[PDB]
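Quick one:
INPUT:
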């Protein structure tokens, strides 16, 4: 079921999970919840998501509560500003510490509670 895009395979889940249970599922398949580091990757993901919400590898880290990628890609605040839905991250209820892809637009990301269940997207490097 994995889809190939620019040197990576992607798994769009059929079953919803909390953010961490999803990450654990990805890790069990030698992958991680997906990072997003280019407009073309953002586009590939939101087009494939077809208007549905999917957990991605976005999650808060450090005392500052800075966003980070679970796959350890450094998070680039400047280059990522364009990828959030206007108004997000809005940290609703002081309890939105993980990130999903929501809107079918380059401006797609939202922060939501880690314990909410959504479909999720794993990313796995292809190694020739
Ligand atoms: C107890 C409760 O239901 N609280 C509501 C909040 O969830 C909600 O805050 C919004 O939550 C959405 C969730 O989007 S999601 O991807 O489906 O998880 C967005 O994150 C949005 O940014 C938040 O403002 C507020 C507003 O609808 O209503 C509360 O009652
Ligand atoms: Ca939010």
């Amino acid at each position: 079921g994995w889809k190939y895009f620019k040197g990576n395979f992607y798994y769009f889940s059929l079953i919803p999970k909390t953010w961490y249970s999803a990450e654990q599922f990805c890790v069990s398949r030698n992958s991680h919840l997906t990072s997003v580091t280019s407009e073309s990757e953002q586009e590939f993901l939101y087009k494939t998501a077809g208007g549905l919400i999917y957990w991605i590898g976005l999650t808060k880290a450090g005392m500052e509560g800075d966003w980070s990628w679970v796959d350890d890609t450094p998070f680039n605040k400047v280059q990522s500003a364009r990828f959030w839905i206007p108004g997000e991250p809005n940290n609703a209820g002081n309890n939105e510490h993980c990130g999903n892809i929501k809107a079918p637009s380059l401006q797609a990301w939202n922060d939501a509670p880690c314990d909410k269940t959504f479909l999720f997207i794993c990313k796995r490097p292809y190694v020739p």
